[PDB]
Amino acid sequence: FKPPPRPDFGTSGRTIKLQANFFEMDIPKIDIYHYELDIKPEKCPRRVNREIVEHMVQHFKTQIFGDRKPVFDGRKNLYTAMPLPIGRDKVELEVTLRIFKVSIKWVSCVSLQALHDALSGRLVPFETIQALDVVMRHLPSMRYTPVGRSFFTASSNPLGGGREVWFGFHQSVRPSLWKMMLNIDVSATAFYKAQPVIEFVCEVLDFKSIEQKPLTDSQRVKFTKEIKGLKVEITRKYRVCNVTRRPASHQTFPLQQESGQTVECTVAQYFKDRHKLVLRYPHLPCLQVGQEHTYLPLEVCNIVAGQRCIKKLTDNQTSTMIRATARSAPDRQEEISKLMRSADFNTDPYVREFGIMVKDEMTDVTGRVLQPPSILYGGRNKAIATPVQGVWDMRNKQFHTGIEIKVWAIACFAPQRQCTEVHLKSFTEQLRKISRDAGMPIQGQPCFCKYAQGADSVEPMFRHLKNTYAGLQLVVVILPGKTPVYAEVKRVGDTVLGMATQCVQMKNVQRTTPQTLSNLCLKINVKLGGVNNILLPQGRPPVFQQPVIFLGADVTHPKPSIAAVVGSMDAHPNRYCATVRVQQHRQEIIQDLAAMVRELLIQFYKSTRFKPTRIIFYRDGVSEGQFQQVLHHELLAIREACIKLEKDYQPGITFIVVQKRHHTRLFCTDKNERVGKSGNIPAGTTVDTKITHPTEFDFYLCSHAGIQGTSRPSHYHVLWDDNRFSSDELQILTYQLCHTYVRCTRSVSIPAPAYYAHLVAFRARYHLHQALAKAVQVHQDTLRTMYFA
RNA sequence: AAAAAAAAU
């Protein structure tokens, strides 16, 4: 129900000086006056609401607002630094821009002293924090295009396909111990370019020029996908709901004449009669707007400016976006500073009105660089790897338990013309040598090596292979770029036949490298039930003194959402079992969690003959505004699973939410602490003192090495803890769990269970309502291992 | 899909 208080502060690791993009706010102890607004019509966009309020304030300055400067949340909430001479009866006003009836009303008083008190125990008024947020973002909301908690403006920076890059910034008011903090970060997102729809068609369908004939059923579907749901404007604004199958010259709608009789009239004829316009491109289809019979010719419409792209970016579009937005930690820090200078909060008329001051310097924070765990390998010398800067390798090292592979097949879906027999021979030869060094000895040539084309030849090939070659362990599949055969390989391999398969690009077969092959063996060994490595047993937190299961949960959204929950099946912890469910479209709560947890607990017991005394639950993809809902349903669900298992089974539950999607950045104060070209904080720096929750149990942990851009320190918030973790042990625990990810010899940004859950859900996507839950269900033998690696 | 990191009428 209620998150536990922070148990302690923790002292492990060497200290490091840091700066965070949190700027201290000096806030008065005055009272804020909260006014509610009823404005009619009530379905207007927040910007129109803001202009109405804006003109309402000036227009009624003499009798109502005077010199006061009210702030407005865009909807119903207006705040003033001093009370309006209206409290507390009904005041109805009329506002003209085009006429609106605005009534205004004092709801309560926001005590800022009651905010100061919460910042030091007194265990936090969400409404007071919200009031300040409204104050800080009133001015930028008028000047920029607000997107969620961010602001953007047009800069000229194309992504292609009518998409554009707008630069801007995130801004939010956050609580911490003793102080309100202003979180400020640079940002950039995809927007649709403001242009005639005709040109939008060209960029979408790859036309240098529109100049022609009606679109094929192929072109129209692609175009319909892009423009659907977008706003257009007449050269009045409309919402595009569909693209007509027919051209404007033939697309009809019922038109009532003066006789009263309704006749079908073409869009072209109407625009000719009514608007004196002979359609220049009558062969093109129309935009259907409003709801079901308004049709608009493409040539009279423009894509409305200020529309953010929500739909999935192409691989090239995102890359360009990654590129134009990626930059080192020192670079990012300087631009946050510049934004602070340009924002100039201490001269903003509205924060001045509310007597607020914002410190110009980033908050100084002492971080702690946790010691990485030793990594134990096997083979001849049972070598121990020491992670350096979040990275180690397997030179002179062999798998903890390597799988001696004797039977395997190759299925090349790359053309023999490009992936010739000498490539395969060379590829096989190099692969076996590396596997030999890795302690996963591939013995003997492949028992089978063939060519095939199309996703439709996978199963008959796979049935063949299973029946004929006894003890068949692995099928290495070779693919040419992006193609739907990969999805079919996984479906047949994971769900119906239950065979371990390892896909690999054609180019990685033609030109092989020792590092690529080594990484390939990492996935192969674990998919055959092997153990690449384990955490050094004696170098583990006290939680491993009793049987314990680690859970990773995550739900991915697109039609249906996909919930995935993984669970550790040994005490290392190394091997994980996967549970997955299709569920309601865009529902964050894992509906069938109890059943999923039950399955995992059963599997844990069948593998270790132990029942875990502790359940450590890492939950990814949850925002702070949802913390009480997921905790309510999911903690109860986990608890329901244990009770349903056995009446008196009551293991301690630790519920932790992991967040990568936030805007707190940590920068090295000392240049000597900067790592690599990107100049990021080292792997393992932990923060839980100055920018964290005033009362609750939360911390930042950057467990990964920053390769490019600015690192995102993962945030962890303990929603529940029966197990009474200290700060140090938990922080050390999650950090060590980040070293158990099998796909690479690197510490990753989130603990392996959380990461695995993401992979499981992503794999479920390739697996494609009774049917949806069955096309996602996995084969019996496959479930015994980590197929999703 | 070798892999991690990195922006989202």
mmCIF file of N, CA and C (backbone and C1' of nucleotides) in Angstrom, chain A residues 275 486 490 508 523 665 712 749 755, chain B:
data_model
loop_
_atom_site.group_PDB
_atom_site.id
_atom_site.type_symbol
_atom_site.label_atom_id
_atom_site.label_comp_id
_atom_site.label_asym_id
_atom_site.label_seq_id
_atom_site.Cartn_x
_atom_site.Cartn_y
_atom_site.Cartn_z
ATOM 1 N N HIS A 275 -16.312 26.001 -55.315
ATOM 2 C CA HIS A 275 -15.088 26.743 -55.024
ATOM 3 C C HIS A 275 -14.361 27.255 -56.264
ATOM 4 N N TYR A 486 13.058 -14.564 -40.526
ATOM 5 C CA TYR A 486 13.542 -14.565 -39.149
ATOM 6 C C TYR A 486 12.412 -14.844 -38.162
ATOM 7 N N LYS A 490 12.030 -18.313 -35.750
ATOM 8 C CA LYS A 490 11.786 -18.236 -34.316
ATOM 9 C C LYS A 490 10.481 -18.916 -33.918
ATOM 10 N N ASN A 508 28.024 -11.172 -41.931
ATOM 11 C CA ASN A 508 28.826 -11.666 -40.818
ATOM 12 C C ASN A 508 29.349 -13.076 -41.073
ATOM 13 N N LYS A 523 25.656 -16.514 -27.024
ATOM 14 C CA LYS A 523 24.232 -16.788 -27.173
ATOM 15 C C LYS A 523 23.975 -18.273 -27.407
ATOM 16 N N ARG A 665 20.659 13.606 -15.333
ATOM 17 C CA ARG A 665 21.964 13.292 -15.886
ATOM 18 C C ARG A 665 23.034 13.607 -14.852
ATOM 19 N N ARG A 712 22.522 7.245 -19.380
ATOM 20 C CA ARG A 712 21.301 7.338 -18.593
ATOM 21 C C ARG A 712 21.466 6.501 -17.338
ATOM 22 N N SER A 749 22.884 -1.820 -18.494
ATOM 23 C CA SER A 749 22.265 -0.651 -17.867
ATOM 24 C C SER A 749 21.163 -0.983 -16.864
ATOM 25 N N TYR A 755 16.093 -6.991 -18.214
ATOM 26 C CA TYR A 755 16.503 -6.976 -19.613
ATOM 27 C C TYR A 755 15.929 -8.178 -20.360
ATOM 28 P P A B 1 18.790 -14.715 -33.002
ATOM 29 O "O5'" A B 1 18.983 -13.818 -34.302
ATOM 30 C "C5'" A B 1 19.895 -12.725 -34.311
ATOM 31 C "C4'" A B 1 20.338 -12.387 -35.713
ATOM 32 C "C3'" A B 1 21.169 -11.112 -35.846
ATOM 33 O "O3'" A B 1 22.136 -11.280 -36.883
ATOM 34 C "C1'" A B 1 19.192 -10.909 -37.133
ATOM 35 P P A B 2 23.608 -10.653 -36.728
ATOM 36 O "O5'" A B 2 23.980 -10.880 -35.195
ATOM 37 C "C5'" A B 2 24.231 -12.179 -34.676
ATOM 38 C "C4'" A B 2 25.042 -12.111 -33.407
ATOM 39 C "C3'" A B 2 24.711 -10.954 -32.474
ATOM 40 O "O3'" A B 2 23.595 -11.213 -31.639
ATOM 41 C "C1'" A B 2 27.040 -11.035 -32.813
ATOM 42 P P A B 3 22.605 -10.021 -31.209
ATOM 43 O "O5'" A B 3 23.476 -9.140 -30.207
ATOM 44 C "C5'" A B 3 23.931 -9.677 -28.974
ATOM 45 C "C4'" A B 3 24.967 -8.789 -28.334
ATOM 46 C "C3'" A B 3 24.521 -7.371 -28.013
ATOM 47 O "O3'" A B 3 23.799 -7.293 -26.798
ATOM 48 C "C1'" A B 3 26.627 -7.316 -29.091
ATOM 49 P P A B 4 22.505 -6.347 -26.673
ATOM 50 O "O5'" A B 4 22.991 -5.162 -25.726
ATOM 51 C "C5'" A B 4 23.719 -5.430 -24.536
ATOM 52 C "C4'" A B 4 24.848 -4.447 -24.352
ATOM 53 C "C3'" A B 4 24.446 -2.980 -24.307
ATOM 54 O "O3'" A B 4 24.023 -2.570 -23.018
ATOM 55 C "C1'" A B 4 26.233 -3.257 -25.828
ATOM 56 P P A B 5 22.764 -1.586 -22.847
ATOM 57 O "O5'" A B 5 23.344 -0.145 -23.208
ATOM 58 C "C5'" A B 5 24.352 0.464 -22.411
ATOM 59 C "C4'" A B 5 25.081 1.540 -23.174
ATOM 60 C "C3'" A B 5 24.227 2.706 -23.659
ATOM 61 O "O3'" A B 5 24.050 3.700 -22.664
ATOM 62 C "C1'" A B 5 25.543 1.896 -25.448
ATOM 63 P P A B 6 22.617 4.394 -22.440
ATOM 64 O "O5'" A B 6 22.441 5.352 -23.700
ATOM 65 C "C5'" A B 6 23.248 6.512 -23.852
ATOM 66 C "C4'" A B 6 23.252 7.001 -25.278
ATOM 67 C "C3'" A B 6 21.912 7.460 -25.832
ATOM 68 O "O3'" A B 6 21.574 8.780 -25.445
ATOM 69 C "C1'" A B 6 22.954 6.025 -27.390
ATOM 70 P P A B 7 20.117 9.101 -24.848
ATOM 71 O "O5'" A B 7 19.282 9.603 -26.109
ATOM 72 C "C5'" A B 7 19.554 10.861 -26.706
ATOM 73 C "C4'" A B 7 18.571 11.179 -27.806
ATOM 74 C "C3'" A B 7 17.100 11.059 -27.443
ATOM 75 O "O3'" A B 7 16.598 12.177 -26.733
ATOM 76 C "C1'" A B 7 17.481 9.958 -29.486
ATOM 77 P P A B 8 15.406 11.980 -25.673
ATOM 78 O "O5'" A B 8 14.121 11.721 -26.581
ATOM 79 C "C5'" A B 8 13.484 10.450 -26.599
ATOM 80 C "C4'" A B 8 12.353 10.409 -27.596
ATOM 81 C "C3'" A B 8 11.517 9.138 -27.598
ATOM 82 O "O3'" A B 8 10.568 9.041 -26.536
ATOM 83 C "C1'" A B 8 12.131 9.654 -29.811
ATOM 84 P P U B 9 -15.747 22.361 -47.975
ATOM 85 O "O5'" U B 9 -16.210 20.874 -48.306
ATOM 86 C "C5'" U B 9 -15.285 19.799 -48.259
ATOM 87 C "C4'" U B 9 -15.979 18.466 -48.377
ATOM 88 C "C3'" U B 9 -16.588 18.142 -49.732
ATOM 89 O "O3'" U B 9 -15.637 17.675 -50.672
ATOM 90 C "C1'" U B 9 -18.144 17.638 -48.027
#
